[PDB]
């Protein structure tokens, strides 16, 4: 049903149609509406559900939504459209072929590379990497490493790793050398779940020929070391349909009796409770803690401990209470001031794009008035900005 139709742009409705879809959602652009008696309806050959393949002979079978909207608005008074009424290995090969063409183009076509990779799931990017190596005999990561540069290179190479590989390599990078990036180490260890950590530990073993727990011990000290080792084990309790109200109250008293009530801090009891109890349980514990203590769990942490141990406890409680808001706040910090903390911004957008990016955007918009898309737009430029915007998934 490959039909080629010429529409005449008219003041009453323009082209007289609506379109939905686009390669940013990995779907073909499809005619959404056809306003009756207007241009698209007058032709008699356009129907709701037609996939848009060409605009004035310009191929758009793999174009984004804005690219097709931009073509249809600049095609003149006479617009000619060619229409026709599960991710497979074919899609991987076509994606891998287009990425190969964009890399071999003189000057590198970064737009095409960003259009595809930032709009595929992590599992689909592995299928693309498998097909790219079959067709070119080259590794896609190393090909893009020399073809790209700057922040865009950091995003694309990070997107190519599996969730465990990316987390493991980021963990290794935070402890590399004498200067341990405690903030990056804290962000990953406090926010990852049991299933994610068990996979990180397994992959960290393969990539670096040593245990993650053994490397944490070598770069951390004191109670901060005990907190990261216990969290990195990923043996937190899994909650069921059992709300143990008696334990919620006793855990709150124990947290209060171990900190604000006594001189000093019984941090082993803090580490024991906050790392072993399930997340839904600890959420109700922290509210029950407000009934016994004049300060909430976060303020009690600021009053009891200092240094990296304070920073880790502050991040853990935020992840337990509201993890999407936790990432929304860290994204805002990465862009609020002069310049950009690109390491945090890139890592969050890469690691959370497929997890809870919608809930992060919802918390961000509610608290900061503007969208996460908007702040990314004002802090980054170029294809690096477009890649982050695609990982954001849309405005608001």
């Amino acid at each position: 049903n490959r039909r080629t139709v010429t529409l005449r742009r008219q003041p009453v409705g323009g082209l007289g149609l609506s379109i939905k879809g686009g390669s940013e959602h990995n779907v073909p652009v499809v005619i959404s509406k056809i306003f009756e008696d207007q241009a698209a309806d007058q032709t008699g050959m356009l129907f709701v559900g037609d996939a848009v393949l060409q605009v004035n002979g310009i191929h758009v079978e793999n174009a984004t939504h804005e690219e097709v909207v931009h073509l249809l608005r600049n095609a003149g008074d006479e617009v000619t459209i060619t229409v026709e009424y599960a991710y497979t290995n074919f899609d991987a090969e076509r994606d891998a072929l287009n990425i190969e063409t964009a890399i071999k183009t003189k000057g590198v076509d970064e737009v095409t590379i960003v259009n595809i990779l930032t709009n595929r799931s992590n599992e689909q990017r592995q299928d693309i990497a498998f097909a790219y190596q079959r067709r070119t005999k080259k590794e896609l990561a190393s090909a893009l490493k020399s073809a790209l540069s700057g922040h865009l290179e950091t995003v694309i190479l990070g997107l190519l790793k599996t969730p465990a590989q990316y987390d493991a390599s980021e963990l290794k990078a935070s402890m590399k050398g004498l200067g341990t990036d405690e903030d990056s180490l804290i962000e990953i260890i406090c926010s990852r779940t049991n299933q994610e950590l068990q996979e990180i530990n397994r992959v960290y073993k393969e990539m670096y020929k040593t245990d993650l727990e053994k490397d944490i011990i070598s770069d951390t000290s004191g109670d901060f070391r005990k907190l990261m080792v216990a969290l990195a084990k990923g043996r937190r309790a899994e909650d069921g349909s059992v709300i143990d109200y008696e334990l919620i109250d006793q855990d709150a008293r124990d947290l209060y009796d171990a900190g604000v009530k006594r001189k000093g801090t019984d941090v082993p009891k803090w580490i024991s409770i906050m790392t072993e109890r399930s997340v839904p349980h600890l959420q109700k514990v922290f509210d029950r803690y407000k009934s016994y203590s004049p300060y909430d769990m976060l303020e009690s942490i600021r009053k009891e401990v200092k240094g990296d141990l304070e920073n880790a406890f502050l991040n853990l409680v935020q992840c337990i209470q509201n993890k999407p808001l936790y990432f929304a706040d860290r994204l805002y910090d990465s862009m609020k001031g002069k310049g950009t903390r690109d390491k945090v911004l890139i890592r969050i957008m890469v690691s959370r794009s497929e997890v809870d990016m919608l809930k992060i955007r919802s918390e961000f918009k509610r608290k900061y008035g503007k969208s996460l898309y908007y702040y990314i737009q004002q802090d980054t430029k170029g294809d690096y900005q477009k890649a982050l915007l695609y990982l954001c998934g849309g405005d608001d």
Binding site: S18, I19, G22, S32, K33, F35
Partner: peptide, 5 residues
């Protein structure tokens, strides 16, 4: 996700 033209 639709745009009218």
């Amino acid at each position: 996700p639709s745009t009218t033209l």
